[PDB]
Amino acid sequence: MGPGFDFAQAIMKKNTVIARTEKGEFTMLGVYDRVAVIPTHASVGEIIYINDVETRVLDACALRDLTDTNLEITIVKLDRNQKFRDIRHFLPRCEDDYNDAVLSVHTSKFPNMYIPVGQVTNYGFLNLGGTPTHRILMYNFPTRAGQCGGVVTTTGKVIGIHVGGNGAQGFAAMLLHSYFT
């Protein structure tokens, strides 16, 4: 309906796939080449379904910071016959706070879903399902089951992926440029 939704749509239409693991269906953001991200709680194995196609996982890495704390991001390399558009130049270099974000989801359950979540706080530490987690972003929107992996964008930047919520607030894991060099 406006410039925030326009940037979010441009990312969803070219840089997302529907990923299915034994833990359910997730929005999955493709970043470059055959490299994508998904929340670590999706529990990626040797085989994943991508848009309902059986796909071999060539490599998967659950990121942790240098303090050996969970970041809740898993980087996956897919055995797919097509590259993603390279969107690494839309990733922030540093931890930050942001105005006016959109959370965008695409699954069987929630196709073509765009949520104006508003201001985004560099929250930092979160006990996420009992797991100490760093580099969390927070927004005051009552996000729901089925939005995990959703892409958080501002106009011009891809800043995080949705990893959880408490009924009032939603939480995203930061995407940083340095994860994808």
Alpha-carbon span 157 to 80, nearest angstrom: 26
Query: Does an H or E element contain 160, and which?
Result: strand 157-165
Alpha-carbon span 173 to 181, nearest angstrom: 18
Domain ranges of the chain: 1-15+85-181, 16-84
Query: In 10 A of CB 7, how many CB atoms?
Result: 19
Active centre residues (catalytic):
41, 72, 148
DSSP code for 156: T
Resolution in A: 1.2
Experimental method: X-ray
Residue 177 main-chain phi, psi, to 5 deg: -55, -40
Residue 107 main-chain phi, psi, to 5 deg: -135, 175
